[PDB]
Amino acid sequence: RRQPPEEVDVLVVGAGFSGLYALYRLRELGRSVHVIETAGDVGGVWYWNRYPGARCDIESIEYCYSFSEEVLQEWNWTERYASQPEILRYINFVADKFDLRSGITFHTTVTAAAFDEATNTWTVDTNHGDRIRARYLIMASGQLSPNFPGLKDFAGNLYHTGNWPHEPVDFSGQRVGVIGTGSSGIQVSPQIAKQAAELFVFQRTPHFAVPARNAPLDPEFLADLKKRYAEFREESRNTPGGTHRYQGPKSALEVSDEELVETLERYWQEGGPDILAAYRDILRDRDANERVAEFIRNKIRNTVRDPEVAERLVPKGYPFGTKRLILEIDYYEMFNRDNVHLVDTLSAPIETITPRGVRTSEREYELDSLVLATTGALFKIDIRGVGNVALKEKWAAGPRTYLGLSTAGFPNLFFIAGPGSPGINMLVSIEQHVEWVTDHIAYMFKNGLTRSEAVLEKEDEWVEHVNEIADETLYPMTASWYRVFMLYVGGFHRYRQICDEVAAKGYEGFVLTH
Numbered sequence: 336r337r338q339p340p341e342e343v344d345v346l347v348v349g350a351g352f353s354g355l356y357a358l359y360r361l362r363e364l365g366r367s368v369h370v371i372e373t374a375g376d377v378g379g380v381w382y383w384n385r386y387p388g389a390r391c392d393i394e395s396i397e398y399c400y401s402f403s404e405e406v407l408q409e410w411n412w413t414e415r416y417a418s419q420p421e422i423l424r425y426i427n428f429v430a431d432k433f434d435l436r437s438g439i440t441f442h443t444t445v446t447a448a449a450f451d452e453a454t455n456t457w458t459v460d461t462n463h464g465d466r467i468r469a470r471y472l473i474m475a476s477g478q479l480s481p482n483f484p485g486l487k488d489f490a491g492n493l494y495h496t497g498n499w500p501h502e503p504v505d506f507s508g509q510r511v512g513v514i515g516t517g518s519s520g521i522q523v524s525p526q527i528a529k530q531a532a533e534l535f536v537f538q539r540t541p542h543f544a545v546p547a548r549n550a551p552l553d554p555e556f557l558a559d560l561k562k563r564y565a566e567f568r569e570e571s572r573n574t575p576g577g578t579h580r581y582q583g584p585k586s587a588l589e590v591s592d593e594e595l596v597e598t599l600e601r602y603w604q605e606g607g608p609d610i611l612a613a614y615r616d617i618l619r620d621r622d623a624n625e626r627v628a629e630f631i632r633n634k635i636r637n638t639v640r641d642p643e644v645a646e647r648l649v650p651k652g653y654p655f656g657t658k659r660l661i662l663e664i665d666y667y668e669m670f671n672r673d674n675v676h677l678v679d680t681l682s683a684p685i686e687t688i689t690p691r692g693v694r695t696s697e698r699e700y701e702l703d704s705l706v707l708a709t710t711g712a713l714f715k716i717d718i719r720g721v722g723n724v725a726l727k728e729k730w731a732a733g734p735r736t737y738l739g740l741s742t743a744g745f746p747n748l749f750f751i752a753g754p755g756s757p758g759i760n761m762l763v764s765i766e767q768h769v770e771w772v773t774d775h776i777a778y779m780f781k782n783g784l785t786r787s788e789a790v791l792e793k794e795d796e797w798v799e800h801v802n803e804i805a806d807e808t809l810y811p812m813t814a815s816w817y818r819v820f821m822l823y824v825g826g827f828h829r830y831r832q833i834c835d836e837v838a839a840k841g842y843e844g845f846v847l848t849h
């Protein structure tokens with residue numbers, strides 16, 4: 336285990352996509368920098384989520400780093416949507432190429448951080464009892480890094496998709512339960528159904544899912560892409576989603592029934608999340624949302640042969656696309672299998688895990704294996720700022736920030752891909768955040784300044800601006816973003832503009848002192 340240094344210019348927490356780029360870029364900027372990572376190796380979510388079928392919902396040609404010309408040319412993606420093992424290979428490749436592991440302490444969890452106003456430095460403590468002093472603290476701890484009764488009593492094998500075993504798990508001949516039908520559950524379930532004698536899928540709220548239509552990547556298409564890759568990326572940087580996506584100019588309410596079917600069916604066959612932008616008002620007008628939503632509901636009823644099973648898979652009562660759109664591969668087809676059973680926990684809630692399996696209010700399920708398809712990381716850290724106020728106390732109602740990058744009362748602390756989550760392609764959003772944050776840190780050293788803190792009045796103005804954009808959309812209607820709405824919905828390109836304008840005006844909204 337590489338022992339962390341006692342002093343460093345910048346301490347980064349997390350060695351996923353965000354933390355590795357922060358370490359790389361601060362090294363290029365001539366700053367001392369070190370990373371603390373709970374995991375045993377690099378990768379972030381792509382290190383932890385090793386379950387079968389784990390796969391990204393953003394095209395491989397967009398979900399990648401762009402800071403390195405050599406990486407853009409040397410690496411060859413293989414499919415439309417890269418699987419977790421391929422993405423992990425990619426990350427390890429980048430870490431190898433730039434010698435990043437020499438600046439990372441693995442198997443180590445940051446537990447406390449306190450700002451010393453007398454020295455303008457953070458004092459950072461770990462679960463190993465390490466004590467690191469850093470002028471700046473960068474939280475690259477992700478936003479995606481259960482309380483059932485009797486969980487400890489289960490006699491079979493318990494697995495979590497978010498911390499899957501590193502050796503593959505053979506479910507052949509087993510009775511298996513999967514709890515959770517979000518992205519993890521929808522991805523892992525069809526893989527288990529191929530091996531298991533019986534598969535029970537425990538579903539609470541049914542989610543919207545559209546086909547991925549994953550396919551191998553045409554290598555002559557890629558070859559042509561690599562010679563214009565820098566241009567292709569700047570186009571992505573100038574979109575609201577941080578990726579190439581057609582912006583449908585028509586309202587969903589102005590076309591006929593046959594045309595809506597025709598346009599939406601063309602998206603359905605092509606696959607991917609681009610259907611979110613089939614019509615300009617899908618996420619802004621509730622009637623337009625329900626019209627597209629009802630098209631998807633009927634595709635579900637059409638794929639599942641059992642009408643009673645099909646209806647319980649149909650999502651009802653909340654808008655399409657407000658929570659992040661899941662791509663499915665043979666998930667709805669899975670319920671036509673004889674060894675697959677949909678368990679509706681809304682009608683019969685889970686009362687307790689038992690030694691034998693799962694008991695709902697109606698039935699006991701005998702299982703050999705149980706799969707739990709599961710401000711988080713920040714709240715487990717005792718971060719204390721000015722006046723020793725706790726970040727968790729201040730962020731109780733939701734995360735109050737300026738630009739999603741910093742919060743007043745907590746100087747020299749920056750969050751990467753935390754609040755504001757601007758683009759749906761997180762790799763474009765991450766690179767923009769890391770570049771902005773590390774440029775600011777470089778600016779502070781250039782000018783001899785040592786303390787950077789968001790102005791409270793500007794933080795409030797930013798919070799009220801985020802809430803105001805949201806009310807033009809249907810996003811506020813699902814409480815998964817809730818008091819303080821924690822998502823800038825104005826689109827990546829406009830968010831990038833705001834950040835660039837602040838930096839060009841001497842970091843307006845921050846107080847810079849020495």
Ligand SMILES: Cc1cc2nc3c(=O)[nH]c(=O)nc-3n(C[C@H](O)[C@H](O)[C@H](O)COP(=O)(O)OP(=O)(O)OC[C@H]3O[C@@H](n4cnc5c(N)ncnc54)[C@H](O)[C@@H]3O)c2cc1C
Nearest residue numbers: 349351352353372373379380391392393444445476477761
């Ligand atoms: C299965 C899955 C699929 C996804 N697919 C997509 C997709 O298709 N598109 C998309 O845009 N996003 C997707 N994401 C979201 C994902 O968060 C981002 O794409 C991106 O990978 C986040 O990178 P990150 O480096 O910021 O955070 P993460 O990859 O979450 O890395 C954070 C790291 O910080 C470490 N850490 C946290 N707290 C501490 C602490 N206290 N001390 C030490 N170390 C700590 C964690 O162990 C973790 O390794 C997906 C996430 C998951 C889990």
Ligand SMILES: NC(=O)c1ccc[n+]([C@@H]2O[C@H](COP(=O)([O-])OP(=O)(O)OC[C@H]3O[C@@H](n4cnc5c(N)ncnc54)[C@H](OP(=O)(O)O)[C@@H]3O)[C@@H](O)[C@H]2O)c1
Nearest residue numbers: 390391392479514515516517518519520539540659680709
């Ligand atoms: N690109 C990808 O393909 C991919 C893969 C994995 C994760 N992600 C990202 O990471 C985030 C999380 O996704 P996730 O699927 O793993 O989790 P999730 O979307 O939050 O859903 C978890 C599931 O478990 C259920 N559940 C939770 N607690 C329960 C309980 N006590 N009893 C019964 N059921 C319960 C939930 O039902 P309820 O809805 O009723 O709570 C839900 O079906 C997403 O934003 C996603 O974008 C992406």
